[PDB]
Design an enzyme around this catalytic site. Structure first.
Site, short mmCIF file in Angstrom:
data_model
loop_
_atom_site.label_atom_id
_atom_site.label_comp_id
_atom_site.label_asym_id
_atom_site.label_seq_id
_atom_site.Cartn_x
_atom_site.Cartn_y
_atom_site.Cartn_z
N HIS B 41 28.54 56.41 46.26
CA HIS B 41 29.73 56.77 45.98
C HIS B 41 30.07 57.79 46.21
O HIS B 41 31.42 58.67 45.61
CB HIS B 41 29.79 56.96 44.01
CG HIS B 41 28.88 57.75 43.40
ND1 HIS B 41 27.82 57.26 42.71
CD2 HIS B 41 28.66 59.07 42.81
CE1 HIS B 41 27.33 58.26 41.82
NE2 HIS B 41 28.01 58.73 42.13
N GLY B 143 27.47 65.43 39.09
CA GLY B 143 27.28 66.87 39.96
C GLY B 143 25.45 65.89 40.43
O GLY B 143 24.88 66.80 40.90
N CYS B 145 24.04 63.56 40.27
CA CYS B 145 23.95 61.70 41.37
C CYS B 145 22.87 62.00 42.21
O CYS B 145 23.47 63.61 42.59
CB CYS B 145 24.85 61.52 41.82
SG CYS B 145 26.39 60.45 40.00
C1 LIG Z 1 29.69 62.25 34.96
C2 LIG Z 1 28.08 62.13 34.95
C3 LIG Z 1 27.04 62.08 34.57
C4 LIG Z 1 25.66 62.01 34.63
N1 LIG Z 1 25.15 61.36 35.11
C5 LIG Z 1 26.44 60.68 36.12
C6 LIG Z 1 27.57 61.06 36.30
N2 LIG Z 1 28.40 60.22 36.70
C7 LIG Z 1 28.62 59.49 36.95
O1 LIG Z 1 28.57 58.49 36.13
C8 LIG Z 1 30.25 59.22 37.51
C9 LIG Z 1 29.81 57.13 37.89
C10 LIG Z 1 30.67 56.92 37.29
C11 LIG Z 1 30.69 55.16 37.84
C12 LIG Z 1 29.77 54.29 38.25
C13 LIG Z 1 29.24 55.90 38.69
CL1 LIG Z 1 27.96 54.89 40.19
C14 LIG Z 1 29.15 57.36 38.95
C15 LIG Z 1 31.48 60.22 37.49
C16 LIG Z 1 31.11 61.11 38.71
O2 LIG Z 1 31.87 61.91 38.51
C17 LIG Z 1 30.26 59.84 39.06
#
Ligand SMILES: Cc1ccncc1NC(=O)C1(c2cccc(Cl)c2)CC(=O)C1
Ligand SMILES: Cc1ccncc1NC(=O)C1(c2cccc(Cl)c2)CC(=O)C1
Lengths: 304, 304
Positions: B41, B143, B145
């Protein structure tokens, strides 16, 4: 999202861990620049620990009696001195992995990470706090002495603790990196009891703010209190008295959440008086006091 | 003495963390040998996350669109491929800090350490477990990820997790290092609910053994039970069914303490039925399930 008891990344400290052997005793040392720091009880036998005279025991030791091994290579010891309860072993090679560092003596209530080591090798890392009675609730076994506690500010490692002993109660005592014990403890196998382990109130409030930021809000109530009223309750429950200095440090958390510090105090007061009623806050069934307001801000902002 | 939620020393993993930027999206990557691994992503905009077609989005990306920075130096990207939900970026330089490593796909109930990172920089380390519903209860912000989960066997780092997303419930989902999600989760901004978060029974029993080893013995009772009887209670309390495989893994803890596994099960049964009555075990007011029997043995023996 989420809130965990997080330790600092330990790499910078792992690169400093060495093994020190003197006679039949082996423990950990901290190698920074051309000096290895370790607990002075490395010179003691088990018989010596009952009532050691460290100056006298040190007269029978020469530079060549301190064996310092960094990973699998031997360091040449060219000087040794005792500073309070630590030995400083001057070696002929500066540690190439020495990070930017400081030696700090922390206050009760302050948190730090510990890199638990055995024979100069890291086994794990965990976060803990200097208790108000100057003990730490660690996880240390025989051979863990010389393992250190530290904080990190971007690239600078602030060393605050060196492990020396376990009390007969299974709690832990040690020194700052100048060899001065936290609290009244002495490096002797004599039963030494710890004082009252009071709860670090400002830390519990900071953790309540972290809970609200993360969605755990059930404990928020319609009340407020005053410092004096709150402190009567704090005294009853063996909580540290809250001062205006503590209220000031909670200011950023108050500002971020819009919950005035005294209102959070009233929520804490009700939790003390009523308990959790089988409920949890941030996955804990008790009030957590080993996160400082700085730790909460850091974790909730993503500081690296 | 003492028992703490301990993470592995993170140095070996810190030396692998890099920053990956693609367009306006920046996250963390894992640099091992000449490959950088990161969540696919990274190629998405916020608009793209609602319903991304990753193969199609990847056609518009070339090697030069992936900016990989290790500390403060840029890595040259000479190849890129997608494997499941991860991108593998071939770089022209092998990471000089690559530790001995393996990629493992863990089972629910297994624990691991996470090195939370932002912009390729480590912020902290904590221990957690793969929940039976294939989520993890972490501490991740935007951030984070690409931050990874791992275990260490002496010198070998076994990477088991790469963080991808937070569920609308604040729990976390990610992949193994082959890019396959744990559980049914997909890398898309669509509401995905987690199943029942059951308690990892074998871990709670292991933690009860750690408690007995460390002096917390109040919960030991005069009873025993059978696997089938215990499991009726486990079902009632949303605990994982205990199998003979779990009893077998608890064998060393049973042997060390002299407390038969089924007797510890009867103590656990009474704790489930009666609660803690305001008491604590290893400083916790709830039954901890994020220590495996291996973790307890390791911590209680001092493995480095
Ligand atoms: C915000 C946050 C906090 C903690 N752990 C991860 C995230 N990020 C996400 O979840 C995001 C996302 C949204 C749907 C699918 C997928 Cl793969 C990734 C939204 C982004 O920006 C990446
Ligand atoms: C056994 C253990 C577990 C955890 N943390 C430390 C220790 N070690 C000690 O406490 C020892 C000791 C005894 C009296 C005074 C002092 Cl300074 C040191 C007994 C040794 O061997 C050193």
């Amino acid at each position: 999202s989420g809130f965990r008891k997080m330790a600092f990344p330990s790499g910078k400290v792992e690169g400093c861990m060495v093994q020190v052997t003197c006679g039949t005793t082996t423990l950990n040392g901290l190698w920074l620049d051309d000096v290895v720091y370790c607990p002075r009880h490395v010179i003691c036998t088990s018989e010596d620990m009952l009532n050691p005279n460290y100056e006298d025991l040190l007269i029978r030791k020469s530079n060549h009696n301190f064996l310092v091994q960094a990973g699998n290579v031997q360091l040449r010891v060219i000087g040794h001195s005792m500073q309070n309860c630590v030995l400083k072993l001057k070696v002929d090679t500066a540690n190439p992995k020495t990070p930017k560092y400081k030696f700090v003596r922390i206050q009760p209530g302050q948190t730090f990470s510990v890199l638990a080591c055995y024979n100069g090798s890291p086994s794990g890392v965990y976060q803990c706090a200097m208790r108000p009675n100057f003990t730490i609730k660690g996880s240390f076994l025989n051979g863990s002495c010389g393992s250190v506690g530290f904080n990190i500010d971007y690239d600078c490692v602030s060393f605050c603790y060196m492990h020396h002993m376990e009390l007969p109660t299974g709690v832990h005592a040690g020194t700052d990196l100048e060899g001065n014990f936290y609290g009244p403890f002495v490096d002797r196998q004599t039963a030494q009891a710890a004082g009252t382990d009071t709860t670090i109130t400002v830390n519990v409030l900071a953790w309540l703010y972290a809970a609200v930021i993360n969605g755990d809000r059930w404990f928020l109530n319609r009340f407020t209190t005053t410092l004096n009223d709150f402190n009567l309750v704090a005294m009853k429950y063996n909580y540290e008295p809250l001062t205006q200095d503590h209220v000031d440090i909670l200011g950023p958390l108050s500002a971020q959440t819009g919950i005035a510090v005294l209102d959070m105090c009233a929520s804490l007061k009700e939790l003390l008086q009523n308990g959790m009623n089988g409920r949890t806050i941030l996955g804990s069934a008790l009030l957590e006091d080993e996160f400082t307001p700085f730790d909460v801000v850091r974790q909730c902002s993503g500081v690296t």
